[PDB]
Design a protein around this ligand. Structure first.
Ligand code: HEM
Length: 249
C-alpha cells in the first residue's frame, strides 16, 4: 500500500553515491551489526494508532539517544556524521535507513529495496516502545503487531537480524554473539536456536519465545532449513520496517 514521493535527480544521484561510500566505510570499520541496530531502533518506535515515531531522523537527538534501549548508539551516530556531511542534500532519516540496507548487503545478506524521500521530523517519540528482551511472544505481538503493524512472519524474519553482531554487558547487560560467524548474514541464528544453548553463544528470552509459540516455531524450522526463504522473507520485512509511517503508514 505505498505511494513513494518524487525526489529530484540530484537527490537520486546522492543516494547512489552514498550507498557506495557506505559499503566501503561499513566494511572497513566492521560495524555492520551496529548500523543495522541503529536503523532498526530508528524505525521500531513507530506506532500506527497515533502515527508517531518511526524512521524520521530523530534518533540523532540527544533526548532519544538517552533512551536506555539505545545504549551504545551514540557511537553509531558519531561514526556516520563525517560521511553524512559529504551528502548534505540527504535527510538523516534516509541516510540511516540506507546504512541499514547496506549493512545487510555487505555482510552477504539479501538486497533490500530502498526508496528515498523520508523527511527529518523534529520531535522524538516517547521512551519505551522498543521491545524488552526478557519478555515473550505476547509482548512481541504488542510491539511489532499492534504498534508497528507488522505480521507474525515479519517478527520471526526480523529476529533473524541477530545472525550478525553481539550483546555487550556494558550496553544491555547481555553478552556475546548469537552465532559463530557474527559478521556474516546467514540463517545460522535459526540453526543455533534449534540445537539449543551452546557455551560462547547467546540466546535472549525473546529469541527463545520463538521456539514455543505455535505460529513462530514453523517459521523458525523453515528458515533453519531454507536460507533462501529466510532471505526472501527478511528482505520483505526489512523493507516494511524501513518504510513505517512513510509513503502511507
Ligand atoms: C525481537 C525483539 C528484539 C529484542 C528484544 C532485541 C534485543 C536486543 C538486545 C538486548 C541487543 C544487545 C545490545 C547490546 O548489548 O549491545 C540486541 C542487539 C542487536 N539487535 Fe536486536 N532485538 C530485537 C529485534 C531486533 C531486530 C528486529 C533487529 C534488526 C532487524 C535486531 C538487530 C540487532 C543487531 C544487529 C544487534 C547486534 C548489535 C551489535 O552487534 O552491536 N534486533 N538486540
Amino acid at each position: 500500500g505505498k505511494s513513494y514521493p518524487t525526489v529530484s535527480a540530484d537527490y537520486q544521484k546522492a543516494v547512489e553515491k552514498a550507498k557506495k561510500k557506505l559499503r566501503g566505510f561499513i566494511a572497513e570499520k566492521r560495524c555492520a551489526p551496529l548500523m543495522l541496530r541503529l536503523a532498526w531502533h530508528s524505525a521500531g518506535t513507530f506506532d500506527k494508532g497515533t502515527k508517531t515515531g518511526g524512521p524520521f531522523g530523530t534518533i540523532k537527538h540527544p533526548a532519544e539517544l538517552a533512551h536506555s534501549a539505545n545504549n551504545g548508539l551514540d557511537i553509531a551516530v558519531r561514526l556516520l556524521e563525517p560521511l553524512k556531511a559529504e551528502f548534505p542534500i540527504l535527510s538523516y532519516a534516509d541516510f540511516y535507513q540506507l546504512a541499514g540496507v547496506v549493512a545487510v548487503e555487505v555482510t552477504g545478506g539479501p538486497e533490500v529495496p530502498f526508496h528515498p524521500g523520508r523527511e527529518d521530523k523534529p520531535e522524538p517519540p516517547p521512551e519505551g516502545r522498543l521491545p524488552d528482551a526478557t519478555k515473550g511472544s505476547d509482548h512481541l505481538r504488542d510491539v511489532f503487531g499492534k504498534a508497528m503493524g507488522l505480521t507474525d512472519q515479519d517478527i520471526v524474519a526480523l529476529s533473524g537480524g541477530h545472525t550478525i553482531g553481539a550483546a555487550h554487558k556494558e550496553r544491555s547487560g547481555f553478552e556475546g554473539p548469537w552465532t559463530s560467524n557474527p559478521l556474516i548474514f546467514d540463517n545460522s541464528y535459526f540453526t543455533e536456536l534449534l540445537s539449543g544453548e551452546k557455551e560462547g553463544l547467546l540466546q535472549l528470552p525473546s529469541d527463545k519465545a520463538l521456539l514455543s509459540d505455535p505460529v513462530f516455531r514453523p517459521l523458525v524450522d523453515k528458515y533453519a532449513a531454507d536460507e533462501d526463504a529466510f532471505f526472501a522473507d527478511y528482505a520483505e520485512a526489512h523493507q516494511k520496517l524501513s518504510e513505517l509511517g512513510f509513503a502511507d503508514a
